[PDB]
Write a protein that binds this ligand. Structure first.
Ligand SMILES: *[C@@H]1O[C@H](CO[C@@H]2O[C@@H](C)[C@@H](O)[C@@H](O)[C@@H]2O)[C@@H](O[C@@H]2O[C@H](CO)[C@@H](O[C@@H]3O[C@H](CO)[C@@H](O)[C@H](O)[C@@H]3O)[C@H](O)[C@H]2NC(C)=O)[C@H](O)[C@H]1NC(C)=O
Ligand SMILES: *[C@@H]1O[C@H](CO[C@@H]2O[C@@H](C)[C@@H](O)[C@@H](O)[C@@H]2O)[C@@H](O[C@@H]2O[C@H](CO)[C@@H](O[C@@H]3O[C@H](CO)[C@@H](O)[C@H](O)[C@@H]3O)[C@H](O)[C@H]2NC(C)=O)[C@H](O)[C@H]1NC(C)=O
Ligand code: MAN
Ligand code: MAN
Ligand code: MAN
Ligand code: MAN
Ligand code: CA
Ligand code: CA
Ligand code: CA
Ligand code: CA
Ligand code: CA
Ligand code: CA
Ligand code: CA
Ligand code: CA
Ligand code: CA
Ligand code: CA
Ligand code: CA
Ligand code: CA
Ligand code: CA
Ligand code: CA
Ligand code: CA
Ligand code: CA
Ligand code: CA
Ligand code: CA
Ligand code: CA
Ligand code: CA
Ligand code: CA
Ligand code: CA
Ligand code: CA
Ligand code: CA
Ligand code: CA
Ligand code: CA
Ligand code: CA
Ligand code: CA
Ligand code: CA
Ligand code: CA
Ligand code: CL
Ligand code: CL
Ligand code: NA
Ligand code: NA
Lengths: 642, 641
């Protein structure tokens, strides 16, 4: 039969569970023993009457571990009136709360990503309480915090594990670790707690792109900055951890290739440097996005707008260009001597590629005062005449143009230029004097030389070649061209005929000088050729009438001394000295007749000597004054009559 | 001086810009000419009046490209009254919209991660309009969508570039591509359009862990399921692309080594198989988290709660254990023959480790009807006595216990057991006969043997060895211990004295037989020794009185034959035959007297011849029957007066 008692674990040995003999009204005898003791039993039985007392130590957690019931079963045998009996006894061992919740370790380290969704579960080491029932772990508490809570769950074989659950989204940059106190406690007003620490390690996600310390940057860069010049040390920052926050600098992928060759970005430090050479006169502003990138699985990027303003340097000098209105030779401007005052000759351009004062030009002209500088428009100055030009006075000019910029120091450019004045037919031939006077002795040879005329045209080339022409004029009906000829190149006048003074005294040539111009220019002069007389006409006796060189006149013997017989008149063709007639009645032996040398009047020296019938011959000559003189003779006879 | 006109690009050649002679009130002359004719000039001037017309085509976009202003400069020279003059002229060339916005290429390919925050800018190929001012690129057109909204920004050098900007979070699993044709038109009333293709390709991020078609699953596993048995084909899914969505199955990191050695998960297919062996009697429920993992750089994981409930099979047979109250040998129970009805002898345990009917046991006992089975508690049956036991009748019993479980089919276990009955001193010695009788011849030697007695004790060991003792009783005053002795071991009786029948006829010995037990048991018997006579008593003659064998008697002579003279009496000490008196009348010569052998009376044969004075001599003897017979002698004389 089954008799049942109840004990309480870890009681002092020798406590009264019960007594069989008395509990079951057992009158008779008893030799109460346990039937077998393979291990040293925990309960002792009084042989006298079957009293069951706590023998050794009774630890429920050692004999039943986590089993909800713990019954110690023993078989006692007795003897009553020579009958051996058996009684089966079951002693329920009640549980005492002599064990407290325990955790494996004082700290539980756990890891979770900041990118995990709310509700993600994180395992925790289970607590254990070696008691059973209410004396086992009933409740769990977590320390007050914002993010984490616990939930307890039981497995199908009854093992009661715990989970840490995430309530709010994490951010490792705000908070990267958590320290939470975890505790478990059992039932019954005598309550026992056990504790541990949860160390939550928040693992980083790359949820932050880099960002530059400054969103945009401008830097100034001299256009003569040397290679390696440091423009700027770019800086960025990333809050993420380790590689996710480690930055590498460079260009935005859209930056053209010119910039990538001109400028360089150190990928580690962000230094931005010049590797090429810039030129303000070509491009004065660069605009590009630099970028920063973190070294993460899914990299994040940020950009910074960089502006480089290039600054101008005086690296250009003035350029002088000269373009003439009219010219043939290089670097020579031509202009007609006919150009009026303030005529444009050539245009000067003075330019400077730079900007500001460095590109501003002052132009100055050096040369004869006949030319002036006149500004036409920006950096464009005209050369203009200030006075009338005269090729015959000045045929060319050498000029000098200087152009300086306003840099400090300034660049100076110098250039030379030549002006040549074009000929117009501005001057006509000019005879030394308008009227020339020359003389020619009568009875010349034919083809004799009289004179030469000269006219002058100072114009050059064909416009200044003189041509001489005999103007056609009449001379005693006939034309001038028959008496005289003129070499049209030299202007030499040659006589074609032999001239006779007795006929023609003066010959008036009219010569024209012409240039080889278009229109032709002419001028006239006159040569007054003088023919002067000579002694080629001997005088002739007119009265008395001549008969083969002889004559006769009679004389009355009735007449006085110094008689008026006859009057010898004579004529000469020449002029002046050569027409000075002097008379002589001479060589007669006896002095018979006497002559008046003035008016050729012949008188008698002797008295009336004979009566009648006398013949007397003498000679009477007429001469002129010129050298050599010529003369003619008349032989006249006189007779005495009554 | 600078005189200013204005024209419009690509106008009809020969069109009138203006007239210098008339515009500048130029009275006088003019032989208007250009100074520069080294390249083929695009403007020609009429000599008469200085009016210049468009010679060739004038294309602003080719002489000034993208330059805001386009002024052609020309230097003309005239001659007025022999004076050469110069006039500088600036002809503004105005732009018309004979050029349309355009994009460098027919397609713009673009890639963006679905994980990019709002506001991320994607650069786009810049548009170009070769006109200037309002005729330049003024407007950018965007396609209506929820995620991409673009923004136009202007640079230091005035070009209007456009950025593709994202305002709302993308999801490549929701939407993975976009195709947007990008075009722009310029300002001013006649607008010209130009276009390209934008192909937005969304790149995948590993933003979705795998998840199982079922969060938990339970499977039943027979405890005799063979190695390789298929428990379950795990299935999991991942929306992500390529390797980010390709799964490998295995155990959660917390799974003990017992489970990892016992069960196996194929990483590729997720098949869960038994490689070891389970035993319901050892562990009947397994619980573990299987997990699936995507093959991504930093993979994402999911778990599935797997329950394996083990099923019981009848793989254990009942075990029989027997524990006796009292025992010496292995597998042998002892019990005293003194036990009463229904005394506990031994406890049988019949158990089966299985569960259900497979573990439920029926116990049956086979053997002598003196023992039966009585259940004490669960799987615990008592062997009990049913009747009184007697070691002397049955000392040992061979029993058999049978224990079957209730499986289908059932397991049966048999066991043998032996019970031995312990001896108690329940029996006392008992003699063959209660009263023994033997005889002894008189006059025996001293120290002679009479008989031997034997008693019987069936009890065992000391409880059955008999010792005999002579009970102290008196015989004619003295104690019996003096006539006889008893050997306590053999039971032999030796005669101590020599016995005389005349005195002692019957000797009543009282023997006790006792066993060697505690308490000691005794029983008594009696030996009646009878003493029988012998002939060691010679008889003597009493009447008449004797004198060394002689006597004398007188008688008167007056009588005939047969007279009463004298009467010869004798006595014998023995009994029976040896006390048989025989009378003899011995020789006297003459036939004088004759004797009656019955009553010892002697008479006379001859008459009275003599009166007085005669002496007569004879002998008369008495004898007994025994062998040898004994006799004494007496001589009697008779005389007359
Ligand atoms: C204007 O300038 C011309 C150009 O000549 C010069 O060339 C350079 C070397 C520099 O000196 C410049 O400053 C200058 O422009 C002058 O022409 C030169 O004239 C001289 C003298 O008349 C010539 O030399 C002569 O040669 C002949 C024959 O060999 C000799 O008989 C003379 O005795 C004399 O040495 C020279 O050839 C000529 N140069 C050229 C290139 O033609 C010119 O004098 C000047 N005009 C004025 C008005 O100043
Ligand atoms: C109770 O059991 C004992 C011993 O246990 C027995 O051992 C074997 C026989 C097993 O097969 C078991 O089945 C069995 O329980 C029995 O004792 C045996 O008795 C036999 C009786 O014939 C003996 O054999 C005889 O022995 C004599 C003298 O030695 C010979 O002259 C005969 O020719 C014959 O062989 C045997 O020796 C004996 N053995 C032992 C170990 O004791 C016993 O019989 C049994 N009791 C009952 C009532 O069945
Ligand atoms: C166990 O102990 C804790 C303190 O460690 C208590 O707060 C709890 O209520 C239980 O008694
Ligand atoms: C659990 O354990 C902690 C530290 O071990 C204690 O501070 C707490 O009161 C509880 O007993
Ligand atoms: C080209 O087309 C666009 C619209 O498609 C207009 O903005 C433009 O004016 C031109 O017609
Ligand atoms: C610009 O060009 C596209 C083709 O690339 C046209 O489809 C569009 O209408 C616009 O004219
Ligand atoms: Ca305890
Ligand atoms: Ca406890
Ligand atoms: Ca507890
Ligand atoms: Ca963060
Ligand atoms: Ca982060
Ligand atoms: Ca980052
Ligand atoms: Ca430069
Ligand atoms: Ca410069
Ligand atoms: Ca300069
Ligand atoms: Ca002149
Ligand atoms: Ca001239
Ligand atoms: Ca001239
Ligand atoms: Ca002459
Ligand atoms: Ca003359
Ligand atoms: Ca003369
Ligand atoms: Ca155009
Ligand atoms: Ca245009
Ligand atoms: Ca346009
Ligand atoms: Ca997605
Ligand atoms: Ca995805
Ligand atoms: Ca995935
Ligand atoms: Ca099993
Ligand atoms: Ca089983
Ligand atoms: Ca079974
Ligand atoms: Ca008995
Ligand atoms: Ca006995
Ligand atoms: Ca006995
Ligand atoms: Ca005797
Ligand atoms: Ca006798
Ligand atoms: Ca006798
Ligand atoms: Cl003459
Ligand atoms: Cl005797
Ligand atoms: Na830096
Ligand atoms: Na599968």
């Amino acid at each position: 039969k089954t008799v049942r008692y109840r004990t309480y674990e870890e009681d002092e040995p020798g406590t009264v569970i019960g007594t069989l003999a008395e509990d079951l009204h057992l009158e008779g005898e008893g030799s109460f023993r346990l039937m077998k003791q393979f291990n040293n039993s925990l309960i002792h039985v009084r042989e006298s009457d079957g009293q069951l007392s706590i023998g050794e130590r009774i630890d429920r957690e050692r004999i039943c571990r986590q089993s909800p019931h713990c019954t110690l079963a023993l078989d006692v045998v007795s003897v009553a009136k020579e009958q051996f009996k058996l009684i089966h006894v079951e002693v329920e061992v009640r549980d005492i709360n002599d064990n407290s919740p325990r955790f494996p370790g004082a700290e539980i380290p756990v890891e979770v990503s900041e990118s995990a969704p709310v509700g993600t579960r994180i395992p925790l080491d289970i607590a254990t309480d070696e008691d059973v029932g209410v004396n086992s772990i009933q409740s769990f508490q977590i320390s007050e915090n914002s993010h984490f809570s616990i939930d307890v769950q039981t497995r199908a074989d009854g093992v009661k594990y715990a989970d840490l659950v995430l309530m709010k989204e994490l951010d490792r940059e705000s908070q990267s670790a958590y320290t939470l106190e975890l505790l478990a406690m059992d039932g019954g007003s005598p309550s026992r707690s056990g504790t541990t620490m949860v160390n939550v390690r928040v693992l980083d996600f790359n949820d932050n792109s880099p960002v530059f310390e400054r969103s945009s940057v401008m830097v100034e860069l001299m256009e003569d900055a040397p290679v390696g010049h440091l423009l700027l040390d770019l800086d960025a920052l990333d809050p993420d951890e380790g590689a996710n926050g480690e930055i590498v600098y460079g260009f935005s992928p859209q930056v053209p290739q010119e910039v990538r060759q001109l400028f360089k970005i150190d990928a580690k430090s962000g230094r931005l440097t010049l590797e090429g050479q810039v030129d303000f006169e070509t491009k004065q502003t660069y605009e590009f996005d630099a970028q920063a990138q973190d070294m993460a699985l899914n990299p994040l990027t940020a950009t910074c707008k960089v502006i480089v303003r290039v600054i101008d340097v005086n690296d250009n000098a003035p350029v002088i260009g000269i373009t003439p209105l009219t010219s043939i030779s290089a670097g020579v401007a031509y202009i007609t001597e006919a150009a009026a005052r303030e005529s444009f000759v050539a245009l000067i351009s003075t330019t400077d590629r730079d900007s500001g004062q460095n590109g501003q030009v002052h132009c100055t002209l050096y040369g004869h005062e006949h030319f002036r500088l006149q500004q036409a428009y920006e950096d464009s100055y005209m050369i203009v005449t200030t006075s009338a030009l005269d090729r015959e006075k000045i045929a060319e000019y050498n000029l000098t143009v200087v152009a300086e910029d306003l840099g400090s120091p300034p660049f100076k450019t110098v250039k030379q230029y030549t002006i040549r004045v074009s000929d117009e037919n501005d001057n006509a031939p000019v005879f030394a004097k308008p009227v020339y006077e020359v003389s020619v002795l009568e009875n010349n040879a034919p083809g004799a030389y009289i004179t030469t005329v000269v006219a002058r045209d100072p114009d050059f080339g064909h416009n200044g070649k003189v041509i001489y022409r005999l103007v056609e004029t009449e001379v005693m009906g006939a034309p001038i061209t028959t008496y005289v000829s003129l070499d049209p190149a030299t202007g030499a006048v040659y006589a074609l005929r032999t001239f006779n003074h007795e006929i023609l005294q003066q010959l008036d040539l009219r010569i024209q000088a012409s240039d080889g111009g278009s229109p032709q220019l002419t001028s006239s002069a006159i040569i007054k050729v003088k023919i002067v007389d000579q002694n080629d006409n001997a005088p002739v006796i007119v009265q008395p009438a001549l008969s083969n060189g002889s004559a006769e006149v009679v004389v009355p013997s009735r007449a006085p001394h110094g008689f008026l017989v006859t009057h010898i008149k004579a004529k000469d063709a020449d002029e002046g000295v050569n027409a000075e007639l002097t008379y002589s009645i001479a060589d007669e032996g006896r002095n018979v007749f006497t002559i008046n040398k003035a008016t050729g009047e012949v008188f008698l020296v002797a008295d009336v000597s004979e009566a009648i019938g006398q013949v007397f011959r003498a000679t009477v000559s007429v001469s002129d004054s010129g050298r050599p003189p010529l003369s003619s003779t008349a032989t006249i006879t006189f007779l005495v009559t009554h």
